[PDB]
Design a protein around this nucleic acid. Structure first.
Lengths: 111, 226
DNA sequence: GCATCCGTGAGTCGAGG
DNA sequence: TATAATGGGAGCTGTCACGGATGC
RNA sequence: CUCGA
């Protein structure tokens, strides 16, 4: 279904704050923002889609994403908060794209 | 949900299939209802004060405390509650009943409590002298439903009793939420001074809690049953 | 056990354009 | 890189016999 | 496609 202004703004906000949260998690963990993003995305999507990302220095397999997920879950509450922020960020991302798949058609039909 | 129409169910509560969610909405499934974008946030701020009231001794009913709606006294004839101080009148009417404050200069000099069945005979900003009638109590008089009497002190003088009531109640304040704003506080949560209720794009449009109170969400944009 | 829809064959060579 | 934009658009159909899933 | 055998 097509988004209302409120739903749209909400999702966009969740995405932005999610990215900021990934940045903060990179600050704390000392890890790579890209790696963290890929782990969060992996957990949100599921075991079905776990492939190696070109830019990553480490091959993205369920083992590594589990190690990183356990390195994330082992954080203090106020630090572990950003993880939840990030997860909901990715979810909002998926929903935002999927909600805006019609516009692409309406434009593409002219090319 | 249509504009300006409030929900019949509350946020977080279980739902049955077919059970109406609102005057125009019937839930097809069973589960947990959730509020989607509450457009009006009502905050019940907690107020604990100490007010006074003089009554005929015969009409009064002796109690150590008073629950809401409970009878405070019964007058056989119309009684005139009089000011025992001089000053300007600040009339603060609640849903039912009122708080009448007398002040000289900036400083408050008196604080009287008018229970239900006590028509105030003064307006806001009025100057009164001592002995002047502030309110007429006719027939039975009871505690308002929104205010409760925690403690009661009684001072016998002449053929009257003077009650120092330690009252506690809540006062509501509504806030209209705009689509670009987001409520960062759940239903029935307790806030203090300085705590944010609704966030916004720009700091000057944020909703910060003035004093201590509880949060209530009304008029959701829609309701998500899950 | 019998009608219905689908996929597939349907000559050779030669010439022009 | 920022007004807002949110589900396409082709489409004449004059044969025939078989193996087939089917599917009536 | 049209022509030829």
């Amino acid at each position: 279904p097509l988004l209302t202004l409120e739903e749209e703004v909400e999702l966009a906000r969740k995405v932005e704050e999610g990215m900021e949260a990934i940045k903060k998690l990179s600050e704390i963990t000392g890890l790579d923002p890209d790696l963290i993003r890929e782990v969060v995305r992996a957990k949100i999507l599921g075991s079905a889609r776990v492939r190696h990302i070109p830019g990553l220095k480490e091959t993205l397999d369920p083992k590594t994403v589990e190690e990183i997920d356990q390195k994330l879950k082992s954080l203090p509450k106020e630090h572990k908060r950003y993880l939840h922020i990030a997860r909901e960020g990715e979810a909002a991302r998926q929903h935002l794209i999927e909600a805006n798949l019609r516009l692409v058609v309406s434009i593409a039909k002219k090319y | 949900l249509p504009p300006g129409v409030d929900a019949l169910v509350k946020d977080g509560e279980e739902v049955v299939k077919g059970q109406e969610l609102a005057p125009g909405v019937v839930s097809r499934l069973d589960g947990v209802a959730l509020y989607r974008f509450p457009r009006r946030v009502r905050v019940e701020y907690v107020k604990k004060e100490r007010a006074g009231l003089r009554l005929p001794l015969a009409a009064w009913v002796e109690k150590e405390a008073y629950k809401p709606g409970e009878i405070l006294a019964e007058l056989p004839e119309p009684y005139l509650f009089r000011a025992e101080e001089e000053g300007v009148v600040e009339l603060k009417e609640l849903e039912e009943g009122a708080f009448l404050v007398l002040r000289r200069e900036d400083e408050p000099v008196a604080t009287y409590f008018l229970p239900v069945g006590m028509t105030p005979l003064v307006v806001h900003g009025e100057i009164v002298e001592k002995g002047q009638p502030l309110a007429e109590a006719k027939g039975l008089l009871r505690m308002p439903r929104q205010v409760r009497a925690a403690q009661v002190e009684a001072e016998e003088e002449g053929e009257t009793v003077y009650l120092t009531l330690f009252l506690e109640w809540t006062e509501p304040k509504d806030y209209r939420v705009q689509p670009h704003m987001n409520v960062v506080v759940p239903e029935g949560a307790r806030v203090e001074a300085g705590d944010k209720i609704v966030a916004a794009i720009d700091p000057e449009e944020e909703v910060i809690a003035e004093a201590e109170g509880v949060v209530h969400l009304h008029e959701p944009a829609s309701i998500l049953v899950v």
